[PDB]
Amino acid sequence: LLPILSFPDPRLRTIAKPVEEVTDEIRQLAADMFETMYAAPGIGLAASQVDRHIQLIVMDLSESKDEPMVFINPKVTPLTTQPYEEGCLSVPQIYDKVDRPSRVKIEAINLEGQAFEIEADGLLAVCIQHEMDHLNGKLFVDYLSPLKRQRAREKVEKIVRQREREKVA
Numbered sequence: 826l827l828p829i830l831s832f833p834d835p836r837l838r839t840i841a842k843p844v845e846e847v848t849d850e851i852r853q854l855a856a857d858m859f860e861t862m863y864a865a866p867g868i869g870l871a872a873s874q875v876d877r878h879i880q881l882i883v884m885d886l887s888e889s890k891d892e893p894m895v896f897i898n899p900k901v902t903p904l905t906t907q908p909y910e911e912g913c914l915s916v917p918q919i920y921d922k923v924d925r926p927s928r929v930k931i932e933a934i935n936l937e938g939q940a941f942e943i944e945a946d947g948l949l950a951v952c953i954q955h956e957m958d959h960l961n962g963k964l965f966v967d968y969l970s971p972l973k974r975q976r977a978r979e980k981v982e983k984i985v986r987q988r989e990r991e992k993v994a
């Protein structure tokens with residue numbers, strides 16, 4: 826399982842590079858990203874989060890863990906906000922409210938290298954926007970008040986340290 830970078834790691838601020846071609850190394854990265862995300866568990870993971878700074882997002886919003894979606898080189902444009910309690914595998918076990926445009930259009934390519942365009946509302950609009958932020962080196966904590974940020978940071982470093990401690994046990 827690929828290791829997920831944790832806030833405040835500076836590599837999470839890297840702006841991702843476009844994918845040149847959907848080769849079989851990015852197909853294998855995507856499957857490992859899904860694996861990593863499904864194990865967490867989470868519903869979304871940007872390649873930036875596993876220290877591969879390319880424009881790849883994996884996502885599965887299904888209670889069954891069997892509706893997987895891929896977005897390569899994505900473009901997101903609002904079609905107009907709504908509140909939602911967001912978390913992030915790179916800000917582990919921290920959830921808070923962020924307010925994002927509630928309807929968006931997504932243009933991206935899939936793992937066969939074909940282009941698509943869809944309109945998104947609901948959980949889809951929140952998630953795509955959250956993951957596109959990762960690709961621009963941004964985290965959902967950047968929209969919270971700074972006392973919630975250093976507090977999330979102190980909790981995360983604790984959580985990272987326990988996870989290290991759990992591996993020694």
Ligand SMILES: [Zn+2]
Nearest residue numbers: 912913914915
């Ligand atoms: Zn995230």
